[PDB]
Design a protein around this ligand. Structure first.
Ligand code: CLA
Ligand code: CLA
Ligand code: CLA
Ligand code: CLA
Ligand code: CLA
Ligand code: CLA
Ligand code: CLA
Ligand code: CLA
Ligand code: CLA
Ligand SMILES: CC1=C(C/C=C(\C)CCC[C@H](C)CCC[C@H](C)CCCC(C)C)C(=O)c2ccccc2C1=O
Ligand code: SF4
Lengths: 212, 202, 39, 738
């Protein structure tokens, strides 16, 4: 009864509806086993969140670029700023890897042992380093605004909208990637051009998308 | 069932030990689909020729049908408010939708008026029979008043559709051999029933 | 699907995989460190 | 009454039994406990007759297996075409064929294997191919590598379609037995549709594409200059210019004035002097002839109207006084067993590939083909080897059927039965005729070598001393040379420059010349015939002693394959028809080796060379060094081994390396072909003591190979070594000296 991505075909076995965005879409049966399925759930969540980040950053920098504010284009900002300031590739990379490794291995051993992270083995902390769901570590910090502890219906709706916008952001970031690698240009600029003439400023005329 | 003459000299409608695509249901379904297509295609292939012969349309249009762009080597036309490919694309998406949902109907009967579709489901309920769902749109006027008249109409449809398939093949063969237009061939064979013929075209 | 995974974990497939890994490693090594003989 | 019948969803699509090894045999599916389990699992994966006993089941299985084979072939073809498109000097060779050498396989600049990137011309480097795809494609009319590219893409798509068709017609809508049994419909369909329409569409493609563009290429116009096939199709004006018949369309053909179309439907005979190929108009006329012939043939048998014949009725109608019941029941045996069909078809197939090799070196059909002597040699010997193998397989599966699915009741007084009766007289006769030929033919050579090394060449057997002349062959050659004057008055030349005549050369290189026949060739032909009869004897015993024997009267129940019957009654090693096929394969290898040696030496010595007259590569030492064995060894072998044994530091180092490797593995086979599994198992046991003492004995018990397994591994290794050695030698030598 749930809207099935392929209207007319029934969902497979493991795809049920308990999770957010269960449009019955796993035509490759990649989620029969519940271990692997919870696993790919956490994977999809983190990826959607990263994509939401990336889209926001790219679009804001691109606006700042079109407007006369000197902001570079995203695929160059890195080199341009690292050469601007007195930064070292090695030191930046190593500090980044340090901190990310710490936080991420903590999340990992939490997924392994679902409770052993708020065990006070930290500084003194507990009731915050303890998970709430598989990939939903809302405590006093990861949900400091405290919506997870109120109006479970509204909370479910928020999980739904979160995963929806996450999938959209993933698709849009890949959009950006192709836009740039094809038009050798700025994304917002390609946008303005297709605005100028949708009939002719489009992939049908980009002469690469359609290789004819 | 409609339009049979007992004529199946090759005998494929045999309903026993059937399977795959060879099954009278799907087969006659394909026949009626082709009939409706060929009807539309014949009407189109002809229309602009005579329409410009009567001169009611600007001579800018009314080029011969095989030149409108489908085969650029056969000659292309231009002036369309967009590119052939830019049109081809939206054509892809629209036909994808229509054909796919018709197929989902035929494969899981009645199951294509259920998923929320902007209220555009009650019409897609139709009959339990492909090629004849009827419903408010697909039978706009309540046609088939007498069921005798209904069978009569189905018969007439299959008749005209087979005629149309024949006519479309005729257009193809003439336009390849004599290279002219269809109405061109007509005007000629009219001018000379004897000296405007495939015998003359040898 | 689990049937398929076990089919993968069958022996000849795993042998092929491990050998492919070893060979690819050796090849990349001889690429980046051509003709070593000492140390 | 014939129609279409099918059954739905016979077997699902799941990995369940994919996780169940050996599911097809209830025996093996119960698990492994010893090594030989794995051998058996691999061995009988495809033994469908031992899997189950449903004709329809085995039938659906072999159908989908056919589809798999087809898909594989399409894959490999697309691979060839894509390699030719992307990594070749093909367009350079199109510009100049006569000095640019085909090269498509390129190596990677790594630890040192880059030295093989031979400078083949065209500013290109790599490895010379011998397949001849270049000349083939030029013959067809491929100019743009874009064409090779799209061709490869289409081939891949076709392979995918084949695999899908296999899956479908096995798992979703499987046919039925009678629909597999509608043999008259099958023959009508094949002979008419397949071959008739193949030759027809072939003639069409030749005419409308490959004739004009090749006329232009031979006219010498720039390659890329030549217009495009679709332009050739569209503009009748261009084709009218090329051949003034094209202006008239088809009306003259319709009016039965076929003579006017003779402009490009020719009957020249002979060759094309600019390319050394045959006349493309002539081949087009040929293919038209074949097309109509086979399409008319496809209208023979009755299927759903009384018109047409009944194979079984025709079969029974032919009975003889000396023969009893004659051909009765054969329609049954053939309509019932796969193995009879497989035997017959393999036999014909092998013979046909042999004929292909011969005809093709005889009358080279492609442009610039005769030039690459390497390509000629390679194609010839490859197709010959394949023919030999197919024929031996025919024999094998014949005997297999005879053991397994024959029935005595149905055939009381049969041709088959009476043959089984007088098998003894037959085999004895064949024995004697063989040993006679062996004696005479080989003793001649030994007598020659003795008369030489003794110091009395006066009494040898050559063209100089006491002579032997292939009078019959010379006579036939004479007659085929003089034929067109009277026999085929509308033939403008002999169909082969070998019948006699002038010499056609291109690019300073000979393309053909009348071929001499000497006492040497007489003796070589007779050695050929002897070894052939011997192989035939081996296989005929292998089949006629299938069910039983005057030694073993119960051979049948013991199966087709088994080691022995114990040392009983004096030792019974090697008594199975499987072992018959074993040894037959041995002697087949010997014969084919000798025949390709004959071919190579004759070509190199007395046809090949360059025009100045001609300069034969060995100047003609053959007709005097090929009738003594010492002369053979030294002057031919030990001679021509030069380039292959000095091919180092060059792009030919690989050939020498493979020469060595092949000698090695060929010798290695002998341990297997000589040892005995009991010793192996004992040593295995001592090894198990060793391991186990450390508590590292394997859970899978170690068992030495089965007796037949030892035999088979030995033969495979030996054959591999021998054929690889000769292959490497041939390639290196001819590429060096040509
Ligand atoms: C814009 C869409 C969106 C929505 C509707 C939600 C909704 C929610 N998030 Mg948030 N979240 C989002 C994007 C979104 N998130 C993104 C892009 C990130 C990456 C920075 C996160 C990272 C994140 C974390 C790490 C956590 C939440 C949590 C939550 C829940 C409480 C707040 C709620 C279901 C908390 C939760 O799971 O509480 C149970 C929680 O721990 N979110
Ligand atoms: C996520 C949504 C999204 C959106 C809103 C757009 C929007 C646009 N894309 Mg598309 N595009 C996207 C994802 C998206 N794209 C993705 C995922 C891909 C990978 C296939 C591409 C690859 C792509 C190319 C290669 C091109 C466009 C182009 C365009 C622009 C013109 C319309 C067209 O031809 O397409 C337009 C601004 C064309 C353009 O730049 O026109 C000016 C164009 O050449 N897009
Ligand atoms: C020479 C090969 C071959 C042969 C003898 C057949 C034989 C048959 N096919 Mg066809 N078929 C083949 C290749 C072949 N097919 C290929 C390559 C495909 C893949 C596109 C198919 C896909 C196919 C389908 C999907 C169907 C048939 C059907 C049939 C039946 C009608 C005749 C018959 C069993 C029909 C059938 O079996 O209906 C029960 C049918 O529906 N075939
Ligand atoms: C000669 C023309 C012809 C005839 C006689 C019919 C006859 C019929 N069509 Mg129509 N139909 C035609 C051409 C024709 N169709 C074509 C060319 C198309 C393609 C657009 C269709 C598409 C179509 C659909 C989609 C449906 C009908 C339906 C019908 C039925 C009711 C409408 C009616 O009486 O008309 C002087 C009837 C069997 C309806 C039906 O069969 O309902 C049961 C229905 O669902 N037709
Ligand atoms: C089994 C004996 C053996 C040993 C001890 C070595 C030892 C070595 N080989 Mg190897 N090598 C061997 C056999 C052996 N090779 C064989 C059988 C082959 C052919 C498959 C090669 C082909 C080969 C190449 C092509 C190269 C080596 C190289 C090397 C070095 C690898 C580190 C080292 C000198 C590399 C090197 O730098 O050697 C100095 C090198 O260039 N070897
Ligand atoms: C017919 C079988 C076949 C064989 C024996 C090879 C063999 C080879 N291919 Mg492959 N190849 C094939 C089909 C085949 N290919 C097909 C069907 C394709 C199309 C997808 C390709 C496309 C292909 C490419 C694009 C390349 C190879 C390359 C190679 C080489 C290294 C891998 C090797 C010589 C590599 C090579 O030779 O690099 C120089 C390489 O780059 N192949
Ligand atoms: C079997 C394949 C085949 C195909 C697909 C075609 C296709 C065609 N032929 Mg035909 N043609 C063929 C074989 C074929 N021909 C053969 C074997 C002959 C000899 C009998 C001819 C001799 C022939 C002539 C002489 C002419 C055609 C012509 C044509 C075109 C119009 C009909 C058409 C493209 C006409 C054309 O357009 O020629 C350029 C034309 O005048 N064909
Ligand atoms: C047309 C190709 C073909 C096919 C379909 C088969 C099919 C088969 N062969 Mg093989 N076989 C072939 C050619 C072929 N063979 C050739 C050319 C040879 C000569 C080398 C043999 C010699 C051969 C032997 C000696 C044996 C098989 C066996 C088999 C069966 C199991 C594998 C299987 C029915 C084995 C079997 O189980 O036979 C009953 C077996 O013992 N084959
Ligand atoms: C089996 C075939 C064969 C045949 C047909 C001949 C034919 C001949 N041999 Mg004999 N010979 C052979 C094998 C054969 N030899 C072998 C294998 C060794 C010899 C050793 C040998 C000697 C030593 C002599 C002959 C002689 C001869 C001649 C008369 C007898 C004649 C040319 C005699 C002869 O006439 O020598 C000139 C003679 O003296 N042969
Ligand atoms: C040498 C020899 C053996 C001994 C050879 C044997 C048993 C074959 C050994 C095969 C390999 C080398 C061992 C098993 C390999 C498997 C892939 C297991 C994994 C091994 C790892 C190293 C990968 C026989 O058993 C035999 C039997 C009958 C006639 C002649 C002979 C014969 O000549
Ligand atoms: S093991 Fe060998 S020698 Fe012993 S009986 Fe069997 S075949 Fe004969």
């Amino acid at each position: 009864v749930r809207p099935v991505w392929f209207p007319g075909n029934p969902p497979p076995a493991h795809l049920d509806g308990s999770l957010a965005g269960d449009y019955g879409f796993d035509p490759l049966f990649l989620g029969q086993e519940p271990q692997t399925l919870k696993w790919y759930v956490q994977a999809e969540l983190v990826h959607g969140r990263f994509a939401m980040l990336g889209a926001a950053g790219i679009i804001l920098t691109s606006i700042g670029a079109k407007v006369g504010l000197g902001f570079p284009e995203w695929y160059d900002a890195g080199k341009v700023v690292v050469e601007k300031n007195n930064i070292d590739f090695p030191t930046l990379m190593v500090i980044q890897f340090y901190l990310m490794g710490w936080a991420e291995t903590k999340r990992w051993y939490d997924f392994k042992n679902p409770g052993s992270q708020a065990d006070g083995s930290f500084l003194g902390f507990t009731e915050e380093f303890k998970g709430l769901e598989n990939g939903y570590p809302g405590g006093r910090f990861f949900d400091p605004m405290g919506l997870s502890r109120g109006d479970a219906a509204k909370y479910q709706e928020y999980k739904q909208k979160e995963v929806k916008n996450g999938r959209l952001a993933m698709i849009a970031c890949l959009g950006f990637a192709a836009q740039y690698a094809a038009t050798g240009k700025g994304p917002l600029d390609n946008l303005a051009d297709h605005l100028a003439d949708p009939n002719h400023v489009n992939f049908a005329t980009n002469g690469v998308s359609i290789p004819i | 069932l409609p339009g049979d003459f007992g004529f199946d000299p090759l005998g494929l409608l045999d309903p026993v030990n059937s399977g795959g695509f060879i099954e009278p249901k799907w087969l006659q379904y394909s026949e009626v689909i082709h009939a409706r297509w060929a009807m539309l295609g014949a009407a189109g292939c002809i229309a602009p020729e005579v329409l410009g012969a009567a001169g009611l349309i600007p001579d800018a249009t009314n080029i011969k049908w095989f030149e409108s762009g489908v085969i650029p080597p056969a000659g292309s036309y231009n002036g369309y408010w967009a590119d052939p490919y830019t049109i081809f694309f939206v054509e892809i998406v629209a036909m994808q939708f229509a054909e796919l949902r018709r197929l989902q109907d035929f494969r899981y009967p009645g199951s294509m008026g259920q998923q929320y579709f902007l209220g555009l489901e009650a019409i897609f309920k139709g009959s339990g029979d492909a090629a004849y769902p009827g419903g408010p749109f697909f039978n706009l006027f309540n046609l088939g008043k007498t069921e005798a008249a209904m069978k009569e109409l189905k018969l007439k449809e299959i008749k005209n559709g087979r005629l149309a398939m024949l006519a479309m093949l005729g257009y193809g063969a003439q336009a390849v051999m004599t290279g002219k237009g269809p109405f061109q061939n007509l005007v000629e064979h009219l001018a000379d029933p004897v000296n405007n013929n495939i015998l003359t075209n040898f | 699907m689990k049937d398929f995974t076990t089919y993968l974990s069958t022996a000849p497939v795993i042998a092929t995989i491990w050998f492919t890994f070893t060979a690819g490693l050796l090849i990349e090594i001889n690429r980046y460190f051509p003709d070593p003989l000492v140390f | 009454k014939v129609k279409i019948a099918v059954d739905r969803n016979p077997v699902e699509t799941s990995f369940e039994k994919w996780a169940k090894p050996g599911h097809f045999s209830r025996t093996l599916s119960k698990g492994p406990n010893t090594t030989t389990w794995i051998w058996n699992l691999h061995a009988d994966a495809h033994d469908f007759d031992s899997h189950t006993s449903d004709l329809e089941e085995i039938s659906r299985k072999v159908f989908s297996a056919h589809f798999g084979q087809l898909g594989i072939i399409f894959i490999w073809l697309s691979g060839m075409y894509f390699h030719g498109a992307r990594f070749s000097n093909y367009e350079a060779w199109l510009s100049d064929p006569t000095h640019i050498k085909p090269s498509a396989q390129v190596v990677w600049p790594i630890v040192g294997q880059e030295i093989l990137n031979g400078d083949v011309g065209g500013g290109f480097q790599g490895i010379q191919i011998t397949s001849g795809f270049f000349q083939l494609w030029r013959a067809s009319g491929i100019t743009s590598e874009l064409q090779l590219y799209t061709t490869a893409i289409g081939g891949l798509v076709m392979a995918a379609a084949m695999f899908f068709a296999g899956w479908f017609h096995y798992h979703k809508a499987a046919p039925k037995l009678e629909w597999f049994q509608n043999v008259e419909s099958m023959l009508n369909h094949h002979l008419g549709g397949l071959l008739g329409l193949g030759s027809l569409a072939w003639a069409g493609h030749q005419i409308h594409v490959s004739l004009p563009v090749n006329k232009l290429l031979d006219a010498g116009v720039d390659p890329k200059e030549i217009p495009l096939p679709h332009d050739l199709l569209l503009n009748r004006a261009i084709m009218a210019d090329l051949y003034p018949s094209f202006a008239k369309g088809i009306a003259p053909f319709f009016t039965l004035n076929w003579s006017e179309y003779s402009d490009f439907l020719t009957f020249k005979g002979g060759l094309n002097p600019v390319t050394g190929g045959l006349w493309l108009s002539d081949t087009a006329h040929h293919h038209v002839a074949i097309a109509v012939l086979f399409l008319v043939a496809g209208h023979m048998y009755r299927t759903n109207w009384g018109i047409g014949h009944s194979m079984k009725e025709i079969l029974e109608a032919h009975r003889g006084p000396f023969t009893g019941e004659g051909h009765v029941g054969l329609y049954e045996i053939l309509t019932t067993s796969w193995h009879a069909q497989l035997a017959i078809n393999l036999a014909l197939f092998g013979s046909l590939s042999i004929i292909v090799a011969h005809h093709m070196y005889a009358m080279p059909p492609y442009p610039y083909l005769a030039t690459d002597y390497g390509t000629q040699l390679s194609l010839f010997t490859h197709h010959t080897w394949i023919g030999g193998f197919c024929i031996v397989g025919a024999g094998a599966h014949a005997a297999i059927f005879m053991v397994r699915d024959y029935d005595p009741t149905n055939n009381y007084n049969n041709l088959l039965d009476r043959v089984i009766r007088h098998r003894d007289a037959i085999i004895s006769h064949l024995n004697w005729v063989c040993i006679f030929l062996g004696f005479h033919s080989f003793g001649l050579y030994i007598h020659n070598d003795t008369m030489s090394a003794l110091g009395r060449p006066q009494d040898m057997f050559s063209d100089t001393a006491i002579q032997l002349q292939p009078v019959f062959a010379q006579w036939i050659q004479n007659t085929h040379f003089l034929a067109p004057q009277l026999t085929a008055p509308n033939a403008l030349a002999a169909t082969s420059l070998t019948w006699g005549g002038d010499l056609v050369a291109v690019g300073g290189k000979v393309a053909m010349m009348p071929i001499s026949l000497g006492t040497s060739d007489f003796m070589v032909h007779h050695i050929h015939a002897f070894t052939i009869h011997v192989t035939v004897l081996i296989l005929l015993k292998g089949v006629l002693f299938a069910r039983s024997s005057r030694l073993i009267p119960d051979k049948a129940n013991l199966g087709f394959r088994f080691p022995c019957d114990g040392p009983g009654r004096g030792g019974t090693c090697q008594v199975s028809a499987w072992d018959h096929v074993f040894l037959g394969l041995f002697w087949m290898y010997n014969s084919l080796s000798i025949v390709i040696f004959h071919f190579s030496w004759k070509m190199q010595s007395d046809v090949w060379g360059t025009v100045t007259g001609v300069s034969h590569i060995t100047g003609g030492n053959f007709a005097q060094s090929a009738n003594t064995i010492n002369g053979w060894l030294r002057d031919f072998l030990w001679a021509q081994s030069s380039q292959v044994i000095q091919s180092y530091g060059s792009a030919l180092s690989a050939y020498g390396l493979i020469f060595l490797g092949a000698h090695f593995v060929w010798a290695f086979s002998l341990m297997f072909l000589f040892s005995g599994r009991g010793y192996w198992q004992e040593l295995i046991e001592s090894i198990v003591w060793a391991h186990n003492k450390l508590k590292v004995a394997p859970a899978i018990q170690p068992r030495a190979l089965s007796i037949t397994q030892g035999r088979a591994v030995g033969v495979a290794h030996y054959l591999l070594g021998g054929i690889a050695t000769t292959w490497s030698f041939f390639l290196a030598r001819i590429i060096s000296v040509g």
